[PDB]
Amino acid sequence: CQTWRXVSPEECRKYKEEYXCVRCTE
Numbered sequence: 754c755q756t757w758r759x760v761s762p763e764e765c766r767k768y769k770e771e772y773x774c775v776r777c778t779e
Contacts, residue, residue, distance in 0.1 A: 754774035757765055765777040 754776060755768070755772050756776040757768050758778070760768070762779040765775075765779060767779065768777060770776050
């Protein structure tokens with residue numbers, strides 16, 4: 754699982770769809 758922080762929700766959504774399990778806050 755990857756982790757993205759301080760990113761924007763849609764950016765994060767793209768990361769979700771592309772990487773699967775990613776720890777990110779909307």
